[PDB]
Amino acid sequence: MDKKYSIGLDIGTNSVGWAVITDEYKVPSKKFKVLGNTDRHSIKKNLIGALLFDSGETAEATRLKRTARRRYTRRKNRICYLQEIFSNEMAKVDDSFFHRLEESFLVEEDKKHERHPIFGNIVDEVAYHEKYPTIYHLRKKLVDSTDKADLRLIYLALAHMIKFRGHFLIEGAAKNLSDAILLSDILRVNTEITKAPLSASMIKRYDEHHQDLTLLKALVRQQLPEKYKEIFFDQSKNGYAGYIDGGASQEEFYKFIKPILEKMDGTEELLVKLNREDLLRKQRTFDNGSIPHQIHLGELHAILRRQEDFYPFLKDNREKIEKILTFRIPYYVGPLARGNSRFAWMTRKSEETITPWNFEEVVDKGASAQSFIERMTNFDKNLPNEKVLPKHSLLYEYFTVYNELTKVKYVTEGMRKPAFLSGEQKKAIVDLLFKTNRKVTVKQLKEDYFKKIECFDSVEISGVEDRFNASLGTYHDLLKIIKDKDFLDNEENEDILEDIVLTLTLFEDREMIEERLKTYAHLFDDKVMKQLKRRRYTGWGRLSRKLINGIRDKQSGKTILDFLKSDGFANRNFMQLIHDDSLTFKEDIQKAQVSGQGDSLHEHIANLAGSPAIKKGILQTVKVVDELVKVMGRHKPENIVIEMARENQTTQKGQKNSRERMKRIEEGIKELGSQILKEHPVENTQLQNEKLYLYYLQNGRDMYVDQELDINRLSDYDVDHIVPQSFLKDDSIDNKVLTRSDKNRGKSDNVPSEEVVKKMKNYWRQLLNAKLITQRKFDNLTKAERGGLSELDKAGFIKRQLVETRQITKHVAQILDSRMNTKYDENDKLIREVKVITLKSKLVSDFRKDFQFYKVREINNYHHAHDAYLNAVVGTALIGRDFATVRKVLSMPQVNIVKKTEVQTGGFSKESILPKRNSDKLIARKKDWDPKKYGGFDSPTVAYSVLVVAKVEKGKSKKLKSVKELLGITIMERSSFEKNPIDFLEAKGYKEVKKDLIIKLPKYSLFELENGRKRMLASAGELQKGNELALPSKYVNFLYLASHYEKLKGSPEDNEQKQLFVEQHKHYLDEIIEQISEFSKRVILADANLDKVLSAYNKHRDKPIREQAENIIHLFTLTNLGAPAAFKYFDTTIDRKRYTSTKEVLDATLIHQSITGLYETRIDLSQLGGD
DNA sequence: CTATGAGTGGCCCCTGTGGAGAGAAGCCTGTCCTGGA
DNA sequence: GGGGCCACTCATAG
RNA sequence: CAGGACAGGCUUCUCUCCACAGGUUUUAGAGCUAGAAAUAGCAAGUUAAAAUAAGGCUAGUCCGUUAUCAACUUGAAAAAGUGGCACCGAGUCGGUGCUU
């Protein structure tokens, strides 16, 4: 007899809870059959549990890395092109020169020729490096002199130029002076005359650095002898040696040298330079990020112009060289892939290889742009075979206005029931008021159309309250451009103007927008064409031209747009028109609903919107529910599923923050009283852009440094996050702030310095009074006073996870409703055996709180399944003995807490590079670079592990020994291992392989040991805690109340009763401490740490209750699942215990756990490995 | 007399920005509409 | 947060 | 009860593509003098080349960190199938009965 049962689930980023209950709020218990060769044949499990899993990763890192690979590859390709163009000439003077350049990184033994790269002999190399201390000296000497030089010199020069060409941010009488001021900002020197002033500026820096170094050496040796060697010889310290020969930065060097100059007299000029960040500065600095590539282009032009008389090929290929330095892949064409890549959409005019000298000819740029723009366009929900139209299209805005005008019923004198506006009325109103005014209110219509044209002095309007929000913006702009209303009113130009708007919306560039309209050059004058070219439009709608005006109703021959213009007495709007059975439009909608191939559950789940983690979670959830319905006996439940929660906030504050952003910035400027607003016009559409919004927030003063802002400099200004990037991922505006480029590039993963905070706190306080900056934004400035980045600051819940845990309502809804019911009735109406029930967390939260079912996450991982069970019971209840039954249900220790096993994928190892050492644990960077001579990567990640039984040769005697040990397979070797395990094991050094004994052991492969102690295989040589502490509900409640001794929210009576319970049960602390000690001595085995914790507890017996409870909460980290984590107990700090022993699980028993852990196959190793 | 597993503590982790577009989700205001119970 | 590696010490087989 | 689009405003995030600066490692940049050597003293200190996941064949200025994954039988793979129930209790599940 099919019993009636329900299912409850709690969904999170990393967890999936599942629980099945009967009608009486009781979870059924079932005894199953276990597979394997073990003694135990039948075990009993309850029908509750949860599945833990890792968080899904966003693709941002992968996309950034892919862009990095393409960037590096194209850089090397440019280098290769330059090498090809010099190869024919260079081989005449030196054939092996490029061979030396390509083989610099090798050691002398591995090098084929002599170790000196440039000249090949020590004399000329030393002469080079003494004549030119830096490459910029060589650049300057070539650019200013008129003497023939060596081709190697110019090769090194141009190679340096091409590799670091510079930015493209700048495009394209007084303008010459402004350019000179721009260079003056760029270049520290102004007086010296030359065609390559960058070299002059940097050589100036070099000379002053050298002179100041000499002065410091002399004076320091004169006055302070003992610190001389530390400054100029101790590389380990943070002195000059660390600044140059060490890993120290410029700011660190300044910080360390400031006390030295403070204790030292005569440091006036040195302190002045240090306050200007202009002392002892290097060649390669973080300040070069603002260098425009135009300077490099001009210097290249000058050097080629000077050197062209010496070599014909230079003047023959100078245009090509300029192209290489200036060429760039258009941002809309995309990857230049010939079909094989899944990211490409470029169209090929021919089949030749794409080169920077023929890219324009070979690829259809217009078709490429159309393909790029069309990829991300949403398709019509009703006509999947048609595209949406630009939001600035005349037809779309006519749709908007007429739909707004469709439900404008008017009440007059001499009438009884409100009447729809006639089509003639609509047309007259539009032509008389909308074609003349950008914004129209109800007063305008009443006083200008009904009273003036219709002679209806008093008219009442229904369906419009404030005004007609929609506008003829594009129409009015085109009226200003063309000034021909007859052309606009002509219906034979509808297609012409539609393609005009389409072209204005598609292409962002100027050459394309000019080119495609060239066909229509016979319509208007040149000035109209130019102004149209200057015009731009962005955005797309949700409807299609075919629906509104393409298709015609068969019995009437009328379009939907025509119906909107005049629908008679009915005057249906868009929704009634699409939902009216009297027209074939609904039939066309139904027919166009293509019944495409049923997408696989992976495809349906993946085609959704959101992070990969949320679809991973929904896939896990559906797999779990499928397994539960399968095992139960293939009978469907009645009431199931989601808990989904929001905080809706109050409507008033959200509305008031939403309204008047433009007027909010205006009121802020008014409060400050600065004349900025009158200086520069303000527009809400401009406030939509982020950059101008930040500029107006700054009120002309930079946060970091005293500076006067500029409109043009806004392009050079860069937004930086005050909160460090890697420490915490945030793109919120309150975190974001505008600052000058040097300040942004100066600090990476660093909070602003304390001194800057001190000097700018006054202006920041004035901004806070102005209310332009939020309190959190002020706190990011204040974070320096807090002490910088800290552990507790990073331990903050990320908002994206919350967004997703709100986001997965509807998707679960339709997938359950779809797989749930695949059959219809005779009327084709769908009948449901199960109904999806959705509830918010507030109901179950008050259910917990009013009935003492509190929540502590850090006790153990039992809470997910408990919340799922509570969700089930509350969902059943909404649609005494029950509470007692729930109390018993939440008490069993036998809960199928199982973590899913994965094959680790991602990075091969850590990204850092370590110097060479005499060890075997390093990783070669290539197939031929021994880490002994070159270092390499370290700490490679392991993919999974196998248990290998074979014979190994031990000792110098090479005596074979039968062994049974596990060897970890890294991600570096997954393909090799899966390709041919036998050959791989033979090459490694294992002979007589027992292929049947290889067991695929991914991460978290749980191994069961003596006394119920369990361990998950963390890695090839690491283990993590496998058991969990079953804390009784009484201790849970007492601990939660003790932790909340002073912060209970409620009536005084209930709080006082809870306080009395807390104080009367003081002995519970000793009980839980002894329970933790017993659990440790049983499964954790942390005798040293256990003794430390017990000694600290005895020391702190008289401490206040709250601090004790907080510390007890800190203690469960030792007893929690997973890896151990460091924690602090009162004042005492306890280190982590790392299980680096892997000899013990070689004799234990494996248990493979099903997705819910109800079906398992226990396998004994002690029987395996027989000889 | 010397090498090597096994235990404990302390230590280390690549970064930053510009340009261009599209989409999605959330909140609010107004409009109306659609199917039900 | 959490796993990999080296400095230090130490028992045991060869 | 639920959904929709409209238009406006606000906030947040995702997805895809094009560029720029660094950073790290190895080597080149004659180190000198007293002293057999340890050592001592002195001199100099800015730069260059290469690499930036092993590599792969579909050979492209293409791709390589997203997604998927208990065990057994079948299938190359996708995929399909494979495993009893009722009652009483509870410290990692156990106790009783029926049939297989």
Side-chain angles (χ1 to χ4, degrees):
Chain A
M1 183 304 297
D2 292 347
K3 276 187 170 185
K4 316 317 172 55
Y5 40 75
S6 296
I7 302 177
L9 300 86
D10 170 32
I11 306 89
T13 300
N14 286 19
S15 53
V16 168
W18 62 268
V20 174
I21 74 162
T22 64
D23 279 357
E24 311 77 339
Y25 292 108
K26 156 191 303 305
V27 169
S29 64
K30 183 63 66 68
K31 211 178 190 184
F32 303 71
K33 173 59 58 59
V34 298
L35 183 63
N37 71 332
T38 61
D39 180 342
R40 216 179 193 182
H41 302 156
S42 75
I43 191 167
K44 198 165 189 174
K45 296 185 175 181
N46 306 326
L47 299 193
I48 62 170
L51 171 67
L52 301 177
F53 47 94
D54 62 357
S55 307
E57 292 183 0
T58 72
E60 277 306 82
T62 308
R63 183 156 65 70
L64 289 172
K65 184 81 182 162
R66 177 171 61 248
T67 300
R69 323 171 160 91
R70 288 182 187 164
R71 186 180 88 103
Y72 277 109
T73 309
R74 298 173 194 177
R75 154 188 318 174
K76 183 169 182 171
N77 209 356
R78 311 197 215 134
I79 301 299
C80 292
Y81 300 142
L82 170 65
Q83 292 186 346
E84 294 142 16
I85 193 66
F86 290 168
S87 59
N88 264 7
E89 318 304 334
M90 186 66 204
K92 302 172 188 167
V93 65
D94 195 338
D95 64 343
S96 303
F97 182 76
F98 286 85
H99 205 187
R100 288 190 305 275
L101 275 296
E102 72 206 56
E103 289 174 346
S104 67
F105 182 80
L106 321 175
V107 298
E108 188 160 358
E109 304 169 13
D110 179 44
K111 290 171 180 173
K112 294 299 109 181
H113 303 281
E114 216 285 324
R115 69 181 182 192
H116 300 98
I118 297 90
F119 285 102
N121 76 85
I122 188 160
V123 178
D124 292 329
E125 294 286 59
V126 170
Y128 180 76
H129 197 314
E130 56 184 29
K131 292 306 298 314
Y132 308 101
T134 73
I135 192 66
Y136 292 164
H137 298 79
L138 183 63
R139 182 177 292 171
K140 196 169 194 281
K141 182 175 174 66
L142 275 296
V143 65
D144 60 9
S145 187
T146 48
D147 182 349
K148 182 175 182 173
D150 192 307
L151 282 72
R152 296 164 280 196
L153 295 174
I154 62 171
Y155 179 18
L156 275 296
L158 282 71
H160 183 275
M161 326 187 166
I162 288 173
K163 207 159 189 172
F164 291 164
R165 84 170 60 171
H167 76 65
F168 290 78
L169 276 296
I170 179 55
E171 79 296 343
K175 303 206 219 203
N176 315 106
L177 171 53
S178 66
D179 189 359
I181 307 149
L182 183 63
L183 276 296
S184 75
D185 181 299
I186 296 169
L187 295 174
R188 297 159 192 228
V189 297
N190 296 298
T191 51
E192 306 63 24
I193 75 163
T194 176
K195 294 193 171 189
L198 183 63
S199 293
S201 179
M202 187 64 72
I203 191 167
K204 177 41 46 184
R205 259 192 271 184
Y206 181 98
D207 303 337
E208 311 323 316
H209 169 207
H210 177 68
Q211 291 172 4
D212 291 342
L213 182 65
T214 301
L215 294 174
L216 275 296
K217 280 183 179 180
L219 276 296
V220 171
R221 183 177 292 171
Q222 183 66 41
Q223 323 294 341
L224 280 294
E226 61 278 357
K227 293 182 183 293
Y228 182 76
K229 65 178 72 66
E230 192 186 343
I231 291 169
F232 313 89
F233 279 83
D234 193 342
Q235 184 177 2
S236 74
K237 284 293 311 153
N238 190 359
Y240 180 84
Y243 172 61
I244 298 298
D245 301 314
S249 68
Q250 181 181 111
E251 193 185 356
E252 295 163 320
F253 170 64
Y254 281 1
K255 283 317 306 303
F256 171 75
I257 190 177
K258 185 48 150 281
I260 301 171
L261 305 172
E262 184 48 288
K263 284 181 177 186
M264 172 86 167
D265 301 319
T267 54
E268 311 88 5
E269 287 195 341
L270 304 181
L271 285 164
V272 169
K273 282 192 179 185
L274 191 148
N275 294 328
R276 294 179 293 173
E277 303 187 342
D278 293 343
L279 182 63
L280 296 174
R281 205 177 189 80
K282 295 178 180 179
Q283 296 296 288
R284 298 291 180 90
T285 61
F286 74 108
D287 81 330
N288 284 352
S290 73
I291 301 299
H293 73 283
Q294 290 301 319
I295 297 86
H296 285 289
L297 182 62
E299 189 277 332
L300 182 62
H301 178 262
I303 192 65
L304 294 174
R305 276 269 181 158
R306 282 198 190 225
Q307 294 294 320
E308 60 86 19
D309 283 330
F310 300 107
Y311 307 102
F313 86 102
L314 289 174
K315 67 182 290 294
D316 305 339
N317 297 280
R318 50 137 304 162
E319 52 284 30
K320 283 189 179 173
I321 297 169
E322 175 271 333
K323 197 79 177 187
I324 313 300
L325 188 153
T326 50
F327 167 74
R328 176 184 173 202
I329 300 298
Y331 71 84
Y332 53 66
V333 177
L336 305 179
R338 194 202 37 64
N340 284 346
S341 174
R342 76 175 183 176
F343 305 121
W345 61 87
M346 61 80 71
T347 314
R348 302 194 68 107
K349 180 68 173 66
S350 85
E351 285 299 331
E352 294 179 350
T353 299
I354 297 169
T355 78
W357 313 315
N358 62 352
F359 168 79
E360 180 54 43
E361 307 157 357
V362 176
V363 184
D364 191 336
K365 291 191 51 45
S368 304
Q370 180 169 359
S371 302
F372 165 56
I373 192 66
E374 279 174 345
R375 284 303 68 57
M376 296 86 88
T377 76
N378 294 143
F379 275 99
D380 175 330
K381 66 155 173 76
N382 315 299
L383 302 181
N385 300 336
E386 303 300 331
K387 280 189 87 81
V388 300
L389 276 296
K391 186 194 183 336
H392 281 280
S393 179
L394 294 174
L395 295 175
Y396 184 98
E397 61 85 19
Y398 273 126
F399 168 86
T400 70
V401 293
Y402 270 104
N403 190 54
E404 181 65 26
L405 276 296
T406 295
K407 295 310 171 191
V408 185
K409 294 152 311 303
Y410 62 91
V411 175
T412 67
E413 288 175 5
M415 60 80 71
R416 290 188 182 183
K417 294 183 178 182
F420 293 115
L421 292 167
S422 83
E424 290 182 344
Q425 279 182 323
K426 286 179 191 171
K427 186 178 179 180
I429 288 159
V430 166
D431 293 330
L432 285 155
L433 311 181
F434 285 87
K435 281 187 173 176
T436 64
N437 308 105
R438 270 202 174 225
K439 272 192 171 176
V440 186
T441 65
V442 174
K443 192 181 178 186
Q444 297 294 321
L445 180 65
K446 286 188 179 194
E447 292 174 357
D448 303 322
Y449 177 80
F450 276 125
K451 198 168 188 166
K452 284 178 184 158
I453 306 297
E454 294 293 328
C455 300
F456 298 155
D457 299 309
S458 78
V459 64
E460 277 197 340
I461 297 188
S462 60
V464 189
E465 293 180 353
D466 289 326
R467 70 179 184 193
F468 287 89
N469 189 179
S471 59
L472 294 174
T474 308
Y475 156 73
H476 188 193
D477 293 340
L478 294 174
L479 181 64
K480 307 311 298 303
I481 298 167
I482 304 170
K483 310 179 182 181
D484 192 346
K485 196 174 181 185
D486 296 341
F487 194 93
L488 293 174
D489 298 350
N490 188 359
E491 296 189 341
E492 297 182 343
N493 307 329
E494 288 318 271
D495 291 331
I496 298 165
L497 61 83
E498 278 310 302
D499 297 65
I500 284 164
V501 174
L502 287 164
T503 301
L504 288 181
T505 314
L506 291 178
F507 312 94
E508 295 294 328
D509 62 357
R510 334 311 281 191
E511 175 44 42
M512 222 75 87
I513 193 66
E514 182 175 35
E515 190 276 331
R516 176 185 301 288
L517 277 296
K518 165 63 72 172
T519 299
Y520 292 165
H522 61 290
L523 295 172
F524 315 122
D525 60 44
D526 295 331
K527 167 67 54 151
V528 172
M529 295 298 102
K530 208 171 188 180
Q531 178 174 25
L532 279 176
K533 185 204 176 55
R534 284 164 182 192
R535 193 63 186 172
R536 268 280 312 118
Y537 294 115
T538 187
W540 300 83
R542 296 292 189 173
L543 282 72
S544 66
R545 163 62 180 297
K546 173 153 211 299
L547 179 73
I548 323 298
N549 210 38
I551 69 175
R552 297 177 180 265
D553 186 74
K554 283 181 182 169
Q555 65 182 357
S556 66
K558 298 187 174 187
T559 72
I560 284 182
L561 180 154
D562 173 41
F563 275 123
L564 294 174
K565 272 223 181 193
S566 310
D567 205 28
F569 289 100
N571 209 56
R572 304 165 293 191
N573 67 358
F574 174 66
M575 284 72 74
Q576 315 161 206
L577 283 172
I578 68 173
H579 287 138
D580 198 324
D581 303 314
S582 73
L583 306 185
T584 61
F585 296 125
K586 195 171 181 182
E587 284 50 41
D588 275 336
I589 283 163
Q590 280 176 339
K591 299 289 94 176
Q593 293 179 357
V594 298
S595 54
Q597 284 183 351
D599 274 337
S600 71
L601 185 66
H602 179 238
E603 287 159 326
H604 187 245
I605 278 174
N607 291 339
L608 307 175
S611 79
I614 194 66
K615 44 192 162 274
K616 180 183 180 181
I618 191 167
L619 195 44
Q620 298 322 297
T621 302
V622 56
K623 282 183 177 185
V624 175
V625 65
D626 289 339
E627 184 165 288
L628 275 296
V629 70
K630 183 182 178 185
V631 176
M632 173 38 49
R634 333 285 301 288
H635 304 292
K636 277 297 306 173
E638 301 99 11
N639 291 319
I640 62 170
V641 66
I642 61 170
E643 182 179 1
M644 296 300 291
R646 274 70 175 173
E647 45 268 23
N648 290 138
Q649 293 84 18
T650 61
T651 187
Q652 183 62 75
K653 66 91 176 179
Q655 163 204 100
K656 68 181 178 67
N657 305 130
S658 66
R659 56 88 174 173
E660 66 182 1
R661 184 176 178 179
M662 182 177 176
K663 295 183 289 294
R664 120 93 202 258
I665 193 66
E666 293 179 353
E667 299 153 18
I669 297 169
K670 183 178 184 293
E671 190 277 331
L672 293 159
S674 66
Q675 295 298 289
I676 297 169
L677 183 63
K678 64 90 176 179
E679 291 150 29
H680 295 88
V682 59
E683 293 179 353
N684 186 81
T685 80
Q686 288 169 339
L687 276 296
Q688 183 62 255
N689 189 359
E690 203 192 301
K691 183 62 65 68
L692 277 296
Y693 182 75
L694 282 197
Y695 174 71
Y696 285 134
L697 291 165
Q698 295 300 280
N699 206 56
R701 298 292 183 184
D702 185 74
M703 315 280 282
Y704 286 179
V705 65
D706 180 56
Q707 184 178 2
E708 182 45 70
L709 295 175
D710 185 74
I711 316 294
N712 296 115
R713 182 67 178 171
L714 287 169
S715 67
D716 291 331
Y717 285 136
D718 49 355
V719 176
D720 190 16
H721 299 103
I722 297 169
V723 185
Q725 288 70 240
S726 285
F727 164 100
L728 183 63
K729 324 302 151 283
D730 201 12
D731 291 331
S732 87
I733 301 299
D734 63 358
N735 192 16
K736 292 177 71 68
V737 65
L738 193 45
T739 186
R740 185 178 67 189
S741 79
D742 62 358
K743 300 294 187 291
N744 191 335
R745 300 292 179 90
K747 67 181 179 67
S748 179
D749 291 331
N750 287 313
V751 298
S753 66
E754 182 65 26
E755 293 82 3
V756 175
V757 160
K758 299 289 94 176
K759 68 181 178 67
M760 294 298 102
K761 188 269 183 182
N762 189 358
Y763 181 75
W764 290 333
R765 184 71 211 181
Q766 314 147 359
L767 302 155
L768 182 63
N769 317 326
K771 303 292 286 314
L772 295 175
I773 62 170
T774 61
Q775 173 59 74
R776 298 285 75 78
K777 195 172 151 93
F778 193 91
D779 297 331
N780 318 129
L781 316 161
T782 301
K783 186 180 289 293
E785 293 179 353
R786 314 329 320 150
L789 61 84
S790 66
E791 189 38 64
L792 277 296
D793 291 331
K794 181 266 289 180
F797 63 92
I798 297 89
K799 161 156 107 165
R800 295 161 321 92
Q801 281 188 341
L802 294 175
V803 178
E804 299 297 330
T805 61
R806 281 86 170 94
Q807 189 272 331
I808 203 63
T809 67
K810 64 180 74 174
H811 298 286
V812 175
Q814 77 265 13
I815 304 161
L816 292 175
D817 201 76
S818 54
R819 321 156 46 74
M820 185 180 288
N821 291 138
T822 74
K823 67 181 178 67
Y824 294 100
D825 64 19
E826 293 179 353
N827 290 318
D828 274 293
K829 291 174 71 175
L830 179 87
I831 62 170
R832 316 191 157 78
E833 293 83 3
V834 194
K835 64 182 181 293
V836 176
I837 301 299
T838 300
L839 294 174
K840 266 199 172 175
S841 58
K842 188 268 183 182
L843 296 163
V844 298
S845 63
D846 63 64
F847 205 81
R848 280 183 166 278
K849 291 171 184 179
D850 298 1
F851 294 99
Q852 308 180 2
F853 293 100
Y854 312 83
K855 181 67 181 294
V856 176
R857 154 150 151 180
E858 295 85 15
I859 295 175
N860 50 26
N861 295 282
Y862 275 34
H863 64 267
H864 294 120
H866 291 345
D867 274 343
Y869 164 69
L870 183 62
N871 188 179
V873 296
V874 175
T876 61
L878 294 174
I879 193 66
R881 187 182 106 180
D882 289 337
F883 275 124
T885 302
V886 175
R887 281 171 192 165
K888 319 147 187 155
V889 171
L890 295 175
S891 72
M892 283 75 75
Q894 184 271 309
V895 176
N896 273 108
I897 301 299
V898 180
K899 188 173 210 96
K900 194 261 208 172
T901 60
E902 293 69 11
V903 176
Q904 295 297 109
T905 58
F908 292 157
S909 62
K910 325 275 203 152
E911 293 179 353
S912 298
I913 289 282
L914 293 178
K916 69 209 154 174
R917 294 179 293 173
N918 180 14
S919 181
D920 54 24
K921 299 189 178 186
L922 277 296
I923 318 301
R925 292 208 292 144
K926 293 292 184 184
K927 194 179 180 188
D928 291 331
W929 286 337
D930 185 11
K932 299 292 183 182
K933 315 312 168 291
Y934 305 106
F937 297 74
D938 203 346
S939 309
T941 311
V942 74
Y944 56 87
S945 305
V946 295
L947 180 44
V948 185
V949 186
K951 293 184 181 162
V952 298
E953 293 174 10
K954 258 183 177 173
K956 286 186 177 181
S957 56
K958 298 186 175 189
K959 281 186 178 185
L960 280 155
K961 238 186 176 184
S962 301
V963 289
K964 176 183 179 185
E965 64 189 11
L966 61 89
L967 183 63
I969 297 89
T970 72
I971 307 88
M972 211 55 258
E973 59 187 88
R974 195 211 190 160
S975 200
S976 184
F977 175 37
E978 297 267 309
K979 172 59 215 73
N980 193 337
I982 297 300
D983 291 331
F984 182 76
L985 284 169
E986 288 178 355
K988 160 53 191 170
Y990 289 91
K991 277 73 69 177
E992 301 185 36
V993 180
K994 277 74 69 177
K995 188 177 182 179
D996 307 327
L997 303 186
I998 294 178
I999 308 176
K1000 299 298 293 295
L1001 295 174
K1003 197 176 178 198
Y1004 294 101
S1005 291
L1006 188 153
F1007 290 8
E1008 171 270 347
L1009 282 72
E1010 177 54 81
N1011 292 328
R1013 180 173 66 106
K1014 295 180 183 181
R1015 299 284 194 258
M1016 283 74 75
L1017 188 153
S1019 296
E1022 193 39 42
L1023 283 74
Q1024 293 193 2
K1025 290 169 283 174
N1027 290 82
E1028 62 295 359
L1029 188 153
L1031 188 62
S1033 66
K1034 52 170 178 159
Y1035 302 141
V1036 177
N1037 189 358
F1038 174 81
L1039 183 62
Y1040 180 94
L1041 294 174
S1043 59
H1044 297 74
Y1045 192 95
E1046 309 282 25
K1047 65 207 171 154
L1048 294 168
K1049 292 195 175 192
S1051 73
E1053 287 176 337
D1054 265 336
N1055 298 342
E1056 176 273 339
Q1057 181 55 285
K1058 285 166 186 161
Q1059 299 295 322
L1060 183 63
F1061 173 87
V1062 171
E1063 55 164 310
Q1064 286 176 358
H1065 293 254
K1066 183 179 177 181
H1067 62 86
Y1068 277 0
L1069 304 166
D1070 301 329
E1071 293 179 353
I1072 62 170
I1073 300 299
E1074 308 326 297
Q1075 273 312 81
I1076 294 163
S1077 179
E1078 282 194 331
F1079 198 34
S1080 191
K1081 289 175 189 173
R1082 193 167 68 120
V1083 303
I1084 295 89
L1085 311 180
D1087 62 358
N1089 296 115
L1090 178 66
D1091 296 340
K1092 281 180 177 184
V1093 175
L1094 203 164
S1095 180
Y1097 165 41
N1098 179 18
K1099 197 180 182 187
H1100 300 96
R1101 156 158 202 159
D1102 62 358
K1103 283 273 197 150
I1105 297 173
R1106 295 292 300 274
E1107 197 181 344
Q1108 293 179 356
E1110 288 177 355
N1111 289 279
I1112 301 299
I1113 301 299
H1114 308 158
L1115 294 175
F1116 280 45
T1117 293
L1118 182 63
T1119 62
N1120 201 38
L1121 211 57
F1127 63 91
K1128 275 186 170 189
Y1129 178 74
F1130 289 95
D1131 53 349
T1132 308
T1133 302
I1134 305 299
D1135 291 331
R1136 58 187 183 173
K1137 166 66 176 185
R1138 308 184 77 184
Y1139 312 105
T1140 64
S1141 65
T1142 48
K1143 283 55 161 173
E1144 184 178 1
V1145 287
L1146 285 165
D1147 311 317
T1149 306
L1150 282 71
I1151 61 170
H1152 287 290
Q1153 293 323 81
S1154 72
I1155 301 299
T1156 61
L1158 277 296
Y1159 282 42
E1160 68 275 16
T1161 304
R1162 297 184 175 224
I1163 307 173
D1164 184 11
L1165 301 183
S1166 78
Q1167 309 172 21
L1168 292 182
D1171 287 331

